[PDB]
């Protein structure tokens, strides 16, 4: 089949130089013209760039947002896409996706994950919500990176249970509000993979 | 939570030990005394027993006077007694700081309450149930039974705990299955592969589709299922004139 | 210039039922060949972008006949004959006629189709701890609440409110919002929404 399976995502500080590689396995790689399309965290998809066909030139087409910053390349006797990421800045935090045409964008391959933040690797600061007199919650403010998995009554209820997709302050950080809805006393075991931090909440109004 | 707990533990060896003897539960909660008291009954015949030292030694010699399988435990420790029970610290949440209770997923069993609980009580406290409680292995192997549970697997080196599984069904109506783990003595996979025959022998699902994966076999034909034929025949009933 | 092109931002699909999204471009996209320089793609919830029709009408092979493909110069149309609970989505209206193309269009925000919910806003002022550490967050949590349209605001103003949304669940196929007031030392010393669900402004403060 043609799968365009990527790879080259992580975590690195504004102003670094990262590679996106795109395995194109199951056409001529030759005759399309690979693309890259940035989707920034739960927007609209924006295209940075595409390499013409080495037939049609090879004239590398790129973006009024990331021009003199980014180039494109490719192989056929190696058969790989290039994205060569240089002097990151925020904006870059994003799944950037590679797909098999400059204006038919077709298979666009998984989605390589790159983040682009300032901080550093963090366990929560686990910040329970207290009911009015109702719903039951609690933050994990102030993690990084992401994963992050919240349970309540550690893995017992699941019904009612909101895990707000999590989101960046201005600091780079995650904040996550997970947050149950059952009149009552419950427990919310928050476990951050990257530095294993599992951090437990107990909440009373 | 084994290494912690396995580290400071290694500090109550010379006052008390363990034992494992295949005795009924009567005569011995009935001679018990001194410091001495059952850690787990693994069966009606099978009870393993924590006692303090110069009596738990003539515990398993009040089982050579009566001839059963002799064990000093080599690895003998304190559990299940107080001894271990006054580290209200490292023995009772050092070992097991963090944790994740899971849900229903698939039933597992717990023994210190003596039937099926879901797993969200393992962690610290549950060791501290295996060093304050007894354990009712059997109880928990009755329940096992009870919710349609028959071929037992010994996750060891050496069946002492199958051989009193056997033990469950020498006066259990529902005679239950208990593979013969790696015997004392066994460590290669010839002897694996013969357990898996057993397991397989026994009704122990195999997926077969797993042990031929890195073997890179081929199927070839085998002669199919021979059918043990009777005579059904149903004659047209009648007879002529 | 530029092909502007828009579309039903917010249509609700309910499962077994034919929909329809529109596109409407500023300038023409039907090129002098006769065929229209239209693309549909769809990106489902946490996936790939997939191609579902090119050149207006004709669609992508692996894709479901479902989507069917039409359009003049500049209105257009996706017509799903069948919204099953993969139909679900961003559906993107994405010219060919003028490359480059910076964006692939705000994209049509497909949901999951019931009557309108109740906004359970559910005011949390920040535990005390939390101004014992140095921050403030009261969370103004809505919960079950179908379209997710809600302005959600913080008086007695707003400005310092960063938005938590969640995508459309199964069984109640409501949404639910995390509006976080993350918040400095001595300011601390109300949330309100004005969804559809609704009409009369709830102000309930912590």
């Known amino acids: 089949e043609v799968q365009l399976v990527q790879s080259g995502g992580g975590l690195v500080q504004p102003g670094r130089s990262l590679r996106l590689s795109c395995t194109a396995s199951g056409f001529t790689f030759g005759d399309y013209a690979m693309s890259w399309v940035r989707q920034a965290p739960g927007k609209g998809l924006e295209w940075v760039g595409f390499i013409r066909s080495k037939a049609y030139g090879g004239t590398t087409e790129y973006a009024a947002s990331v021009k003199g910053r980014f180039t494109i390349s490719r192989d056929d006797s190696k058969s790989i896409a290039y994205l060569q990421m240089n002097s990151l800045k925020t904006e870059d935090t994003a799944v950037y996706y590679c797909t098999r045409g400059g204006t038919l964008f077709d298979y666009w391959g998984q989605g390589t994950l790159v983040t682009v933040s300032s901080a550093s690797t963090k366990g929560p600061s686990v910040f329970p919500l207290a009911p009015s007199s109702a719903a039951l919650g609690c933050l994990v403010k102030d993690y990084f990176p992401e994963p992050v998995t919240v349970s309540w009554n550690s893995g017992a209820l699941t019904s009612g249970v909101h895990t707000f997709p999590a989101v960046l302050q201005s600091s780079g950080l995650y904040s996550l509000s997970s947050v149950v809805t059952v009149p009552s006393t419950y427990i919310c075991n928050v476990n951050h993979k990257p530095s294993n931090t599992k951090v437990d909440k107990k909440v009373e109004p | 939570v084994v290494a912690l707990r396995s580290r400071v533990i290694a500090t109550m060896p010379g006052n008390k030990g363990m034992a494992s003897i295949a005795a009924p539960a009567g005569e011995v909660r009935a001679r018990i005394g001194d410091r001495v008291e059952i850690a787990a009954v693994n069966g009606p015949r099978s009870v393993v027993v924590a006692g303090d030292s110069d009596e738990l030694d003539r515990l398993v010699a009040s089982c050579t006077t009566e001839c059963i399988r002799a064990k000093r435990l080599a690895v003998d420790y304190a559990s299940h007694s107080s001894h271990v029970e006054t580290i209200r610290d490292a023995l009772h949440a050092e070992l097991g700081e963090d944790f994740h209770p899971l849900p229903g997923f698939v039933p597992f069993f717990s023994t210190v309450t003596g039937r099926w609980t879901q797993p969200d009580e393992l962690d610290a406290g549950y060791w501290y149930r295996n060093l304050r409680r007894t354990v009712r292995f059997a109880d928990a192997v009755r329940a096992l039974a009870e919710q349609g549970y028959r071929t037992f697997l010994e996750v060891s080196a050496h069946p002492i705990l199958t051989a009193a599984i056997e033990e469950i069904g020498d006066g259990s109506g529902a005679d239950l299955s208990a593979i013969h783990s790696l015997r004392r003595g066994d460590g290669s996979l010839a002897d694996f592969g013969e357990a898996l025959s057993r397991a397989f022998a026994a009704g122990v699902a195999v997926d077969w589709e797993s042990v031929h994966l890195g073997t890179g076999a081929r199927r070839v034909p085998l002669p199919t299922y021979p059918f043990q034929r009777e005579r059904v025949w149903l004659e047209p009933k009648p007879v002529a004139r | 210039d530029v092909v502007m092109t828009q579309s039903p931002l917010s249509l609700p699909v309910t499962p077994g039922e034919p929909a329809s999204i529109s596109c409407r471009s500023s300038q023409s996209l039907l090129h002098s060949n006769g065929y229209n320089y239209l693309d549909w793609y769809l990106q489902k919830p946490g996936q790939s972008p997939q191609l579902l029709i090119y050149?207006?009408?004709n669609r992508a092979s692996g894709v479901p006949d479902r989507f069917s493909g039409s359009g003049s110069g500049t209105d257009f149309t996706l017509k799903i004959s069948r919204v099953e609970a993969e139909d679900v989505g961003v559906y993107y209206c994405?010219?060919?006629?003028?490359?480059?193309?910076?964006?692939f269009g705000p994209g049509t925000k497909v949901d999951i189709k019931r009557t309108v919910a109740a906004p359970s806003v559910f005011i949390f002022p920040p535990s005390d701890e939390q101004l014992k550490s140095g921050t403030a967050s009261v969370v103004c949590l809505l919960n079950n609440f179908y379209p997710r349209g809600a302005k959600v605001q913080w008086k007695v103003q707003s400005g310092n409110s960063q938005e938590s949304v969640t995508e459309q669940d199964s069984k109640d196929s409501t949404y639910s919002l995390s509006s976080t007031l993350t918040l400095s030392k001595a300011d601390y010393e109300a949330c309100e929404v004005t969804h559809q669900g609704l009409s009369s402004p709830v102000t309930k403060s912590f």
């Open positions: 050149l207006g009408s």
């Open positions: 994405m010219q060919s006629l003028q490359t480059p193309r910076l964006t």
